[PDB]
Amino acid sequence: ALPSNVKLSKGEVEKIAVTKKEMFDELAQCNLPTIELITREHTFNGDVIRFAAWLFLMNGQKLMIANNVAVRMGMQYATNLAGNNVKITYVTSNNVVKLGHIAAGVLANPYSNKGSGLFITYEHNLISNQIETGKVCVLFITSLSTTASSTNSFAYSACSVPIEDWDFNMIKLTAETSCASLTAMTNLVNSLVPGERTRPVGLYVDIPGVTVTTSASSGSLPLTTIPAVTPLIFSAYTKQVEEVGVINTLYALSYLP
Amino acid sequence: ALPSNVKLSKGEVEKIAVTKKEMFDELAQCNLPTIELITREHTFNGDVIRFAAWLFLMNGQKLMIANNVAVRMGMQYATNLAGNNVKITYVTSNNVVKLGHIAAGVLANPYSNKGSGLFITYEHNLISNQIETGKVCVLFITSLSTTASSTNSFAYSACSVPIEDWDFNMIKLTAETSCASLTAMTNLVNSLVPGERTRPVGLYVDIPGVTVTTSASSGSLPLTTIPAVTPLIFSAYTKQVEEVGVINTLYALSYLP
Amino acid sequence: SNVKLSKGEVEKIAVTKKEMFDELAQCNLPTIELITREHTFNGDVIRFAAWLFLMNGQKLMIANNVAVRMGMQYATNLAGNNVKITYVTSNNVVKLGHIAAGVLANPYSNKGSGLFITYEHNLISNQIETGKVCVLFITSLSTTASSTNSFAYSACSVPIEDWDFNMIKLTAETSCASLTAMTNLVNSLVPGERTRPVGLYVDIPGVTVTTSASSGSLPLTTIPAVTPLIFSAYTKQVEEVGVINTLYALSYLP
């Protein structure tokens, strides 16, 4: 801890750094070489840090409508829209597990209020209300005006990803990385009185083949509920667009690189 | 300072690694050499990562009954069944502090509806309702059927531990590590209709001398509430057995190895 | 085992910054998404973790802590609503941000502890103090189980030029004016009803911190909605004043 700056022994480094051994130890039980299975499972396979961040974002958080859903990899059950645990179906393409889904179940109260949401489904286009075989449907909806505004103005970006190409890591919500959605949303925001302007954010997806579409402005939430029969992957919505950030963060945290 | 493989200086390791200094620095105040007392106490002595993970598990989580209790080491007060801070009494064997307890207080509503829970008390057997002098009493209760099922079927595992041999670390819930509780519990689940079967989890305890007993199937929760006057160490219960995993995680997180 | 490590070995033994980055990395990009960085203490996921729950719900805390963080746009006010931040500057340095307090639904109550920080508005004196940051700490002196209503506060005013979030804490151990006074005041109560004394410690020279007399009713119950507010957080149980310090510590970088 004391010396200026020269090559460290293993013992010195174990003293200066946070070790993986120490991280394992947070969860280790009864002097066993492995973390308990039922813990590993819901814990991103040991990652207590990721799990910590993720956990509160997933639950409660005050302005988020009645139960987020994120079906994670390597698990048996996930909680649906009503907060209940249901069986996961995992989906294969080319011998690889791409994703899981569950029955949406019953959203007690509609989305509302001038917020932002990211929803992801298997084969069920929420906008068009139609099935798209072998695609994953990504939907981002948001207020364009601020919570304090007196203008009702909303929009959405959307795209469909062939299941073979699907990769959780290549999706994000952004206000800085250039792409069709950010550009469109930026133009859409600028239609409002300056005082009522949001910080534009877009649906960025970097998977070749896929183009992301952005709607026109709406003055009414593009999506209010989700049919309970819906094969659902991920669903999260704040009542306050000012916090759209946390929704990107949740999603980023839900799935491994 | 990132692309090569041999022999790092202290200064390089401090850039490449997450350091203890930085972790200390999340909690440091006023350029002082130690973390503030009143913060160290409830923070597992500065372990902010542990504390992060633990915190949300300990509170709210929408399917857990009205207030988990985990009396932690080296603290003044713990919150009881009613969520109120009451004085901890610490217990000594052979000049070593083994564990603390509090008056259980008042569970507003009964445990209920096909869940799982772990309870640990000082000297009070919750099943036999009698005092066992110098024993620590472990009770794990669970549904055998799924939440979706139409069968009321419940069981519990239990054992008593001599206070001198007590070790928070040698207990866990498991579905993989071989033991008498897992075995019994496996056989018990297999008495149900395939579609209603849960993944069996047993109470595992590696303290020599101790044997863990498992009940027969019950169809009615082995345990519904806790007498207010009870000396309580740990109590946690979910309404949904499918998440019994979190209960193991919480417990694992509450006590240091 | 017990000899000089290569960078590959270090990366296998240590938690790396690269891995921490990767908790939040998206789309193979060299930076963490802005809207994510912003509310995340710039990528510090561990800090953000601990902070998050401390800031929200937590059972015994009155209807919405406020803590205006650095480098953000909006912060949640007393009502739980997101409002615009005004950042304040002294000598080309950003010293702090504030928001209109807004409407605290229910009054602070029942034998707790609160830390409050306002720009220029002394909540006790109810008067403007130009160029000062106002720190107020209020607490029960007796325990929740007690049958005595006894309260006190400590307070000080800090010139905006000298303001540093890091030189403030709540303490029961580090010697200071507020600790001493607070210990004396506690010791006027029946032993069984005695709290563990904690003081408002502030290590910015020029500033002295005043501690009140004992009250028998809370020195502060509410906050005028117009108040320029920086930090606000109150538990109903004084036994947990520890968590209020931890929330504060976690809200601002060293």
Coordinates of C-alpha atoms in Angstrom, one line a residue, chain A residues 44-249:
Chain A
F44 CA -26.5 -13.1 -13.5
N45 CA -24.3 -16.1 -12.5
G46 CA -22.5 -14.5 -9.5
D47 CA -22.4 -10.8 -10.6
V48 CA -23.6 -9.3 -7.3
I49 CA -22.7 -5.8 -8.6
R50 CA -24.8 -6.0 -11.8
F51 CA -27.5 -7.7 -9.7
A52 CA -27.5 -4.8 -7.2
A53 CA -27.8 -2.1 -9.8
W54 CA -30.4 -4.1 -11.7
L55 CA -32.6 -5.1 -8.8
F56 CA -34.0 -1.8 -7.6
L57 CA -34.3 -0.5 -11.2
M58 CA -36.4 -3.6 -11.9
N59 CA -38.7 -3.0 -8.9
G60 CA -40.7 -0.2 -7.4
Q61 CA -39.0 3.1 -8.5
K62 CA -42.0 5.3 -7.8
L63 CA -42.9 6.6 -11.3
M64 CA -42.7 3.3 -13.2
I65 CA -46.0 1.7 -14.1
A66 CA -47.2 -1.5 -12.3
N67 CA -44.4 -3.9 -13.0
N68 CA -41.5 -4.0 -15.4
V69 CA -40.8 -7.2 -17.2
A70 CA -37.3 -8.5 -18.2
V71 CA -37.0 -12.1 -19.1
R72 CA -33.3 -12.9 -18.4
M73 CA -31.2 -15.8 -19.8
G74 CA -30.5 -19.0 -17.8
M75 CA -33.7 -19.0 -15.6
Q76 CA -36.9 -20.8 -15.1
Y77 CA -39.5 -18.2 -14.1
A78 CA -39.9 -14.5 -14.7
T79 CA -42.5 -12.1 -13.3
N80 CA -45.1 -10.9 -15.7
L81 CA -47.1 -7.7 -16.0
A82 CA -49.2 -8.5 -13.0
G83 CA -46.1 -9.2 -10.8
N84 CA -46.6 -13.0 -10.9
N85 CA -44.0 -15.6 -11.7
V86 CA -44.7 -17.5 -15.0
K87 CA -42.8 -20.2 -17.0
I88 CA -40.2 -19.0 -19.5
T89 CA -40.1 -20.4 -23.0
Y90 CA -36.6 -20.2 -24.5
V91 CA -36.2 -19.8 -28.3
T92 CA -33.5 -21.3 -30.5
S93 CA -31.9 -20.3 -33.8
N94 CA -28.9 -22.2 -35.2
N95 CA -28.4 -24.1 -32.0
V96 CA -28.1 -20.9 -30.0
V97 CA -30.5 -19.7 -27.4
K98 CA -31.4 -16.2 -28.5
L99 CA -34.1 -15.1 -26.0
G100 CA -36.9 -16.1 -23.7
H101 CA -40.5 -14.9 -23.3
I102 CA -43.5 -15.2 -21.1
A103 CA -47.3 -14.6 -21.2
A104 CA -47.6 -10.8 -20.8
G105 CA -50.4 -11.2 -18.4
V106 CA -52.5 -8.4 -17.0
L107 CA -51.3 -4.8 -16.7
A108 CA -53.6 -3.5 -13.9
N109 CA -53.4 0.1 -15.0
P110 CA -52.6 1.6 -18.5
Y111 CA -49.4 3.4 -19.3
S112 CA -50.0 7.1 -18.9
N113 CA -48.7 10.5 -18.1
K114 CA -46.0 11.8 -20.4
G115 CA -43.3 9.1 -20.1
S116 CA -41.2 6.8 -22.1
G117 CA -41.3 3.0 -22.5
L118 CA -39.3 0.3 -24.2
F119 CA -41.2 -2.9 -25.0
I120 CA -39.9 -6.0 -26.8
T121 CA -41.9 -9.0 -27.9
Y122 CA -41.6 -12.2 -29.9
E123 CA -43.4 -12.0 -33.2
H124 CA -46.2 -9.6 -31.9
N125 CA -46.1 -6.2 -33.4
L126 CA -47.7 -4.0 -30.8
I127 CA -48.4 -1.2 -33.2
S128 CA -49.8 -3.2 -36.1
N129 CA -51.4 -5.8 -33.8
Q130 CA -50.2 -8.5 -36.2
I131 CA -47.8 -11.4 -36.0
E132 CA -44.4 -11.2 -37.7
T133 CA -43.0 -14.7 -38.0
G134 CA -39.4 -15.2 -36.7
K135 CA -38.9 -11.5 -35.9
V136 CA -38.3 -9.7 -32.6
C137 CA -40.4 -6.5 -32.3
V138 CA -38.8 -3.5 -30.6
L139 CA -40.9 -0.5 -29.6
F140 CA -39.9 2.7 -28.0
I141 CA -42.6 5.2 -27.1
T142 CA -42.2 8.6 -25.5
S143 CA -43.6 12.0 -24.8
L144 CA -42.0 14.7 -26.9
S145 CA -43.1 17.4 -24.5
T146 CA -42.0 17.9 -20.9
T147 CA -44.1 16.8 -17.8
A148 CA -44.7 20.5 -17.0
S149 CA -45.9 21.2 -20.6
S150 CA -49.4 21.9 -21.7
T151 CA -49.0 20.1 -25.0
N152 CA -49.9 16.5 -25.5
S153 CA -47.4 15.2 -28.1
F154 CA -45.9 11.7 -28.4
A155 CA -44.2 9.4 -30.8
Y156 CA -42.4 6.1 -31.3
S157 CA -39.6 4.3 -33.0
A158 CA -39.9 0.7 -34.0
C159 CA -38.1 -2.1 -35.9
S160 CA -38.2 -5.9 -36.5
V161 CA -35.2 -8.1 -36.0
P162 CA -34.9 -11.6 -37.6
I163 CA -34.4 -14.0 -34.7
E164 CA -31.1 -15.3 -36.1
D165 CA -29.6 -11.8 -36.0
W166 CA -31.0 -11.0 -32.5
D167 CA -28.6 -9.7 -30.0
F168 CA -29.6 -7.8 -26.8
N169 CA -26.4 -5.9 -26.9
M170 CA -26.9 -4.1 -30.2
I171 CA -30.0 -2.1 -29.0
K172 CA -30.0 1.1 -26.9
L173 CA -31.8 4.4 -26.2
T174 CA -29.5 7.4 -27.0
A175 CA -29.4 11.1 -27.1
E176 CA -25.9 11.4 -28.6
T177 CA -25.0 8.5 -31.0
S178 CA -26.1 9.5 -34.5
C179 CA -28.8 7.4 -36.2
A180 CA -32.2 7.7 -38.0
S181 CA -34.3 7.6 -34.7
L182 CA -32.3 10.4 -32.9
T183 CA -32.5 12.6 -36.0
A184 CA -36.3 12.0 -36.5
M185 CA -37.0 12.6 -32.8
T186 CA -34.9 15.7 -32.7
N187 CA -36.9 17.1 -35.6
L188 CA -40.1 16.1 -33.9
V189 CA -39.2 17.8 -30.6
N190 CA -38.3 21.0 -32.4
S191 CA -42.0 21.3 -33.5
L192 CA -42.8 22.4 -29.9
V193 CA -42.5 25.7 -28.0
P194 CA -38.9 25.9 -26.6
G195 CA -40.0 25.9 -23.0
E196 CA -41.8 22.6 -23.5
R197 CA -38.9 20.9 -25.2
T198 CA -37.6 17.5 -24.1
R199 CA -34.0 16.3 -24.7
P200 CA -34.5 14.2 -27.8
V201 CA -33.7 10.5 -27.6
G202 CA -33.9 7.8 -30.2
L203 CA -33.9 4.0 -30.6
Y204 CA -30.5 3.0 -31.8
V205 CA -30.0 -0.5 -33.1
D206 CA -26.8 -1.5 -34.9
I207 CA -27.8 -4.8 -36.5
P208 CA -27.2 -4.9 -40.3
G209 CA -30.3 -5.4 -42.4
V210 CA -32.6 -3.8 -39.8
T211 CA -33.9 -0.3 -40.4
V212 CA -35.6 1.5 -37.5
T213 CA -38.7 3.5 -38.3
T214 CA -39.8 6.6 -36.5
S215 CA -43.5 7.7 -36.4
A216 CA -44.9 11.2 -36.7
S217 CA -46.2 13.0 -33.6
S218 CA -49.3 11.9 -32.0
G219 CA -50.7 13.8 -29.0
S220 CA -51.7 10.5 -27.5
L221 CA -49.6 7.6 -26.1
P222 CA -48.9 5.3 -29.1
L223 CA -49.3 2.3 -26.7
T224 CA -51.4 2.1 -23.6
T225 CA -51.6 -1.6 -22.6
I226 CA -50.3 -5.0 -23.7
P227 CA -52.7 -7.9 -24.5
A228 CA -52.2 -10.5 -21.8
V229 CA -51.7 -13.3 -24.4
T230 CA -48.6 -11.4 -25.8
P231 CA -45.2 -13.2 -25.9
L232 CA -43.2 -10.7 -24.0
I233 CA -39.4 -10.2 -23.6
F234 CA -38.9 -6.8 -22.0
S235 CA -41.3 -4.1 -20.9
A236 CA -40.6 -0.9 -18.9
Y237 CA -42.2 2.5 -18.7
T238 CA -41.7 5.7 -16.6
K239 CA -44.6 8.2 -16.2
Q240 CA -41.9 11.0 -16.5
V241 CA -40.0 11.3 -19.7
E242 CA -37.3 13.2 -17.8
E243 CA -36.2 9.8 -16.5
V244 CA -36.1 7.9 -19.8
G245 CA -32.4 7.4 -18.9
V246 CA -33.3 4.9 -16.2
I247 CA -35.1 2.8 -18.8
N248 CA -32.0 2.5 -21.0
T249 CA -30.0 1.6 -17.8

